[PDB]
Scaffold this active site. Structure first.
Site, short mmCIF file in Angstrom:
data_model
loop_
_atom_site.label_atom_id
_atom_site.label_comp_id
_atom_site.label_asym_id
_atom_site.label_seq_id
_atom_site.Cartn_x
_atom_site.Cartn_y
_atom_site.Cartn_z
N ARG A 143 27.84 -48.14 6.21
CA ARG A 143 27.50 -47.25 5.11
C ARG A 143 25.99 -47.17 4.93
O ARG A 143 25.41 -46.09 5.01
CB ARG A 143 28.18 -47.73 3.83
N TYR A 162 28.14 -39.80 -4.66
CA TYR A 162 27.02 -40.42 -3.97
C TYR A 162 26.28 -39.44 -3.07
O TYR A 162 25.19 -39.77 -2.59
CB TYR A 162 27.50 -41.61 -3.14
N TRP A 221 39.68 -38.97 12.63
CA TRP A 221 38.65 -39.80 12.02
C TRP A 221 37.54 -40.11 13.02
O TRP A 221 36.36 -39.97 12.70
CB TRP A 221 39.27 -41.08 11.47
N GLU A 278 17.91 -49.86 -15.51
CA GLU A 278 18.93 -50.05 -16.53
C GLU A 278 18.50 -49.59 -17.91
O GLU A 278 19.35 -49.35 -18.76
CB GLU A 278 19.35 -51.52 -16.60
N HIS A 329 36.25 -47.96 -1.87
CA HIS A 329 36.49 -46.75 -2.65
C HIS A 329 37.73 -46.00 -2.20
O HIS A 329 38.20 -45.13 -2.94
CB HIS A 329 35.30 -45.81 -2.57
#
Ligand SMILES: *[C@@H]1O[C@H](CO)[C@@H](O[C@@H]2O[C@H](CO)[C@@H](O)[C@H](O)[C@H]2NC(C)=O)[C@H](O)[C@H]1NC(C)=O
Ligand SMILES: *[C@@H]1O[C@H](CO)[C@@H](O[C@@H]2O[C@H](CO)[C@@H](O)[C@H](O)[C@H]2NC(C)=O)[C@H](O)[C@H]1NC(C)=O
Ligand SMILES: *[C@@H]1O[C@H](CO)[C@@H](O[C@@H]2O[C@H](CO)[C@@H](O)[C@H](O)[C@H]2NC(C)=O)[C@H](O)[C@H]1NC(C)=O
Ligand SMILES: *[C@@H]1O[C@H](CO)[C@@H](O[C@@H]2O[C@H](CO)[C@@H](O)[C@H](O)[C@H]2NC(C)=O)[C@H](O)[C@H]1NC(C)=O
Ligand SMILES: *[C@@H]1O[C@H](CO)[C@@H](O[C@@H]2O[C@H](CO)[C@@H](O)[C@H](O)[C@H]2NC(C)=O)[C@H](O)[C@H]1NC(C)=O
Ligand SMILES: *[C@@H]1O[C@H](CO)[C@@H](O[C@@H]2O[C@H](CO)[C@@H](O)[C@H](O)[C@H]2NC(C)=O)[C@H](O)[C@H]1NC(C)=O
Ligand SMILES: *[C@@H]1O[C@H](CO)[C@@H](O)[C@H](O)[C@H]1NC(C)=O
Ligand SMILES: *[C@@H]1O[C@H](CO)[C@@H](O)[C@H](O)[C@H]1NC(C)=O
Ligand SMILES: *[C@@H]1O[C@H](CO)[C@@H](O)[C@H](O)[C@H]1NC(C)=O
Lengths: 199, 590
Positions: B255, B497, B459, B357, B487
């Site tokens: 990823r 994302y 895939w 944050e 996910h």
């Protein structure tokens, strides 16, 4: 002329910041160093006047607002700082000379009674189908949610409603001695200035 | 009497009067559990959430007495669309029980994963051990065992569960007037309005295809560079013009490419910017870090924090015996109650996760006078993009030198700008074809364009045409390699994302040209400018009450997403890689 009494400021329990008490004086003789020696003054921020000139001049009237207020949150009463304080609890008026004293009421002054918690309001608004309509304060005036907030808050963020108006309180306990706040505004009269220092 | 719209107004006022008082109880009961984990605090949380759900279901049953074609105002229509919204209560009881059993059986199979060696089987790591094996191993035969074992001990079991989860979710989605579950997921970006401000579910696929075809050349140059370095790393295993093997790209799924930074580094003789020692020599703690973050946010015009932020937040890990969760979050509990839970350590990486944050608290403080249902970001990607566009301004040496951290005599040569742009690109541009390919495969699976006999034929064909990644071992039609991601087994959408990296450089390139910047975009700094804070707060104050194309016009002055501000950020890197690579760019699909 005559002596002004500070026993209104020196008995009972000092109320919270939204329900502040006013002490308008007219035609008497003051000695503010007698007042400010009973406390532990930790801040004397003034506007358009000096602390030396505050205790020497003759005025037509004298006003004092006093409430219970911890000195930790001393950076929210400063002119210009849109915060849950100057929007909903107390906004100082600046079209007049003023001074802001923050005291640290000692153990020897037994005539003051310590309350249970400090308190302020986090929002005071009016509901709609489109959102919240906030009701900000006015310089020197009370919040419009005062008739709702005078039922007593028992926990943090405990709301009170009657119709469309809504308020929300916030309380936290008292540790150590008591700390207050004194907003001392003067006014200059055109002809008669009868509030003079005590000689 | 009154018409239908006045009945709608009265119902929404009665909902808004009772929702504020009941949501803060359910949020405070969860805050009292996430910072003090006992069994007495995990019961009040469930009781408060049951009170909230039993309020919400009754109000949603009441809200269906209003036909949606009679409302003329946009905001009341927007608040009744959220409230009617039948959800998963369209199946029968048996189908509902079976779907709720499948959705937790899949997460249970994923969470308890155990892989042992084909060598001496006395080592059987968990998930957090296999994630740390593949992160820092430079062996061709370790990562191959870990990759094949994780995809044959977890993804081999999720296939007969995924084959039923797909069908049950399609039956759930054809009850609420959709077509498949992919339409239910692409209805997150649907708005309606006047000319130009509308957006449908069938336009999002064309939009992400256009953006990916715009963004692909920079990825091709980056892929050619990483392949030329990996050929130096692992000899006689990678083709000079072929795809990269799947078990060498940093982590288990490929990823992020962040862990290839020690291999594919530029001119290495440049120690990086680490202000951790200078922060420890000046004796900084957690309160000083959050005070500096509040000074940064007050420098641009946004308001200060509430007084009930410095008294209720958990800014440090406790020492009085409590057990906490140390993942940083930003909380929005209710009636002007904003708290941050974060286990702050004095480092450089926890200096950026404070400006991140506190970028969520400043967003939640801006739409706070909206209704209850409309207190969210304009999209699912708007909220983590505005928090990441203001961590770009504080990691620059324009900002770390003016704060007193870096010394005044620092050398910003171009060999330190390339070494920073490459480390940014290996985390930002290396994860866009993976995200786009995974979401495109899931959309084609839910639509019915890939039958169940081609879930692994399509895939690894898509993963060779798009990402440029080949498999090390032939996986036939009995594995489920997409289902071995977090996910996918836990039923989350993944396009948030992809539509968040675009609207972060779109925000930064519009905030830096209104702060009067002169230079490249990667050295910008929006501090000490109250003109950028106004353009930010004109977007932040809308919440979810306007279409998100209007809120995007409020900053970027364009109502479409485009990848032209992303290729303006990485333009020195794109000029440097074309000189470094030459003409080896591209791969052959084998
Ligand atoms: C104002 O009040 C003070 C109360 O402290 C009076 O008392 C004098 O205060 C000064 C200032 O510290 C001392 O130096 C004197 O010793 C105090 N005198 C007594 C008798 O205590 C003060 O007199 C008052 N001002 C006027 C003008 O009368
Ligand atoms: C919620 O707060 C916002 C910000 O104050 C209000 O929006 C603006 O209000 C001013 C009034 O001074 C208007 O001139 C602007 O046109 C408003 N802007 C927008 C985008 O609406 C808003 O009115 C408040 N909500 C309610 C219900 O009053
Ligand atoms: C963490 O949670 C525990 C729950 O067991 C809290 O312990 C309770 O605290 C309240 C008020 O402090 C007491 O009235 C209860 O009797 C306590 N229960 C038990 C079993 O001891 C604990 O106080 C929480 N921690 C903090 C810091 O508040
Ligand atoms: C949500 O589901 C309810 C059923 O639980 C739907 O209500 C039905 O609406 C039709 C109108 O087409 C009526 O003929 C039925 O009698 C209603 N059923 C019940 C039990 O009231 C409702 O229309 C659905 N709403 C949406 C937006 O899908
Ligand atoms: C916004 O809505 C308009 C409808 O008024 C869309 O325009 C249509 O787009 C389709 C594309 O499939 C064309 O076949 C129609 O001819 C268009 N209608 C008109 C009147 O031109 C438009 O595409 C929508 N915009 C977005 C971004 O979805
Ligand atoms: C933002 O602007 C303020 C004021 O213009 C800067 O604060 C001053 O910075 C200088 C550094 O040369 C110090 O010598 C002063 O003492 C600072 N003044 C105050 C009141 O703090 C601040 O450094 C600027 N920040 C950035 C990131 O540019
Ligand atoms: C009260 O005042 C007297 C003198 O005025 C002093 O000696 C005493 O310490 C004070 N008491 C306290 C508790 O401070
Ligand atoms: C990369 O290098 C740094 C310093 O040389 C080291 O601390 C880190 O563990 C390395 N990471 C990997 C994945 O090799
Ligand atoms: C970029 O760095 C190289 C070092 O390899 C240097 O030769 C070149 O002059 C630098 N670019 C500019 C514009 O100075």
């Amino acid at each position: 002329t005559q002596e002004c009494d500070f026993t209104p400021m020196l008995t009972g329990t000092p109320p919270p910041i939204y329900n502040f008490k006013r002490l308008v004086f007219t035609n008497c003789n003051y000695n503010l160093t007698k007042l400010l020696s009973l406390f532990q003054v930790s801040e004397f921020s003034c506007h358009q006047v000096s602390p030396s000139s505050l205790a020497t001049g003759c005025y037509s009237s004298l006003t004092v607002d006093y409430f219970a207020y911890s000195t930790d949150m001393s950076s929210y009463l400063q002119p210009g700082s849109a915060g849950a304080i100057v929007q909903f609890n107390y906004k100082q008026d600046f079209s007049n000379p003023t001074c802001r004293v923050l005291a640290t009421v000692p153990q020897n002054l037994t005539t003051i009674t310590k309350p249970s918690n400090y308190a302020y309001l986090t929002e005071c608004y009016k509901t709609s189908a489109y959102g919240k309509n906030y009701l900000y304060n006015a310089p020197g005036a009370y919040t419009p949610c005062l008739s709702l907030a005078s039922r007593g808050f028992s926990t943090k963020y405990q709301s009170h409603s009657d119709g469309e108006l809504t308020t929300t309180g916030y309380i936290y306990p008292v540790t150590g001695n008591l700390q207050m706040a004194f907003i001392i505004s003067v006014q200059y009269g055109t002809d008669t200035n009868s509030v003079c220092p005590m000689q | 009497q009154y018409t239908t719209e006045e009945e709608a107004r009265r119902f929404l006022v009665k909902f808004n009067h009772e929702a504020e008082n009941l949501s803060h109880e359910s949020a405070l009961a969860s805050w009292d559990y996430n910072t003090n984990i006992t069994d007495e605090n995990a019961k009040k949380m469930n009781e408060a959430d049951n009170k909230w759900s039993d309020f919400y279901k009754e109000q949603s049953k009441i809200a269906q007495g209003f036909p949606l074609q009679e409302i003329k105002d946009p905001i009341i229509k927007l608040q009744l669309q959220i409230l009617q919204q039948n959800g998963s209560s369209v199946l029968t009881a048996e189908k509902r029980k079976r779907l709720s059993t499948i959705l937790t059986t899949m997460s249970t199979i994923y969470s308890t994963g155990k892989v042992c060696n084909p060598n001496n089987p006395q080592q059987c790591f968990t998930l957090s051990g296999l994630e740390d094996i593949m992160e820092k191993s430079k062996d061709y035969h370790e990562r191959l065992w870990v990759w094949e074992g994780w995809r044959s001990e977890v993804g081999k079991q999720l296939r007969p569960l995924y084959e039923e989860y797909v069908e049950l979710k399609n039956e759930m989605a054809r009850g609420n007037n959709y077509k498949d579950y992919g339409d239910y997921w692409r209805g997150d970006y649907e708005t309606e309005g006047e000319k130009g401000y509308n957006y449908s579910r069938n336009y999002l696929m064309e939009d992400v295809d256009r953006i990916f075809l715009e963004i692909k050349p920079l990825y091709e140059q980056l892929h050619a560079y990483v392949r030329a370095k990996l050929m130096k790393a692992y000899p006689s295993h990678i083709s000079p013009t072929g795809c990269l093997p799947a078990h060498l790209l940093g982590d288990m799924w490929g990823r992020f490419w962040t862990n290839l930074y020690n291999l594919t580094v530029p001119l290495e003789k440049e120690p990086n910017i680490d202000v951790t020692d200078t922060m420890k020599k000046q004796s900084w703690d957690a309160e000083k870090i959050f005070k500096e973050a509040e000074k940064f946010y007050s420098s641009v015009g946004l308001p200060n924090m509430t007084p009930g932020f410095w008294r209720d937040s958990m800014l440090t890990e406790p020492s009085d015996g409590r057990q906490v969760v140390c993942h940083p979050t930003a909380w929005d509990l209710g009636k002007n109650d904003f708290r941050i839970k974060m286990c702050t350590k004095v480092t450089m990486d926890d200096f950026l996760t404070a400006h991140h944050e506190m970028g969520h608290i400043q967003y939640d403080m801006a739409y706070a006078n909206q209704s209850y249902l409309l207190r969210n970001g304009a999209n699912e990607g708007f909220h983590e993009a505005v928090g990441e566009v203001m961590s770009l301004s504080v990691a620059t040496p324009k900002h770390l030198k003016g704060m007193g951290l870096l010394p005044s005599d620092f050398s910003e040569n171009n060999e330190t700008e390339i070494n920073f742009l490459l480390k940014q690109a290996l985390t930002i541009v290396g994860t866009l074809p993976f995200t786009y390919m995974l979401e495109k495969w899931r959309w084609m699976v839910f639509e019915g364009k890939i039958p169940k006999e081609q879930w692994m034929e399509k895939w690894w064909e898509m993963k060779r045409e798009i990402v440029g990644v080949v498999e090390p071992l032939p996986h036939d039609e009995t594995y489920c390699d997409p289902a071995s991601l977090f996910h996918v087994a836990n039923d989350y959408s993944f396009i948030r994302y992809f539509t968040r990296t675009i609207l972060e450089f779109q925000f930064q390139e519009a905030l830096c040209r209104t702060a009067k910047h002169q230079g490249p975009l990667h050295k910008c700094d929006i501090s000490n400018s109250t003109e950028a804070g106004k353009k930010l707060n004109d977007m932040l104050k809308l919440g979810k009450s306007t279409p998100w194309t209007y809120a995007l016009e409020k900053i970027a002055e364009t109502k479409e997403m485009d990848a032209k501000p992303l290729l303006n950020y990485f333009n020195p890197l794109f000029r440097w890689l074309k000189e470094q690579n030459g003409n080896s760019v591209g791969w052959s699909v084998d």
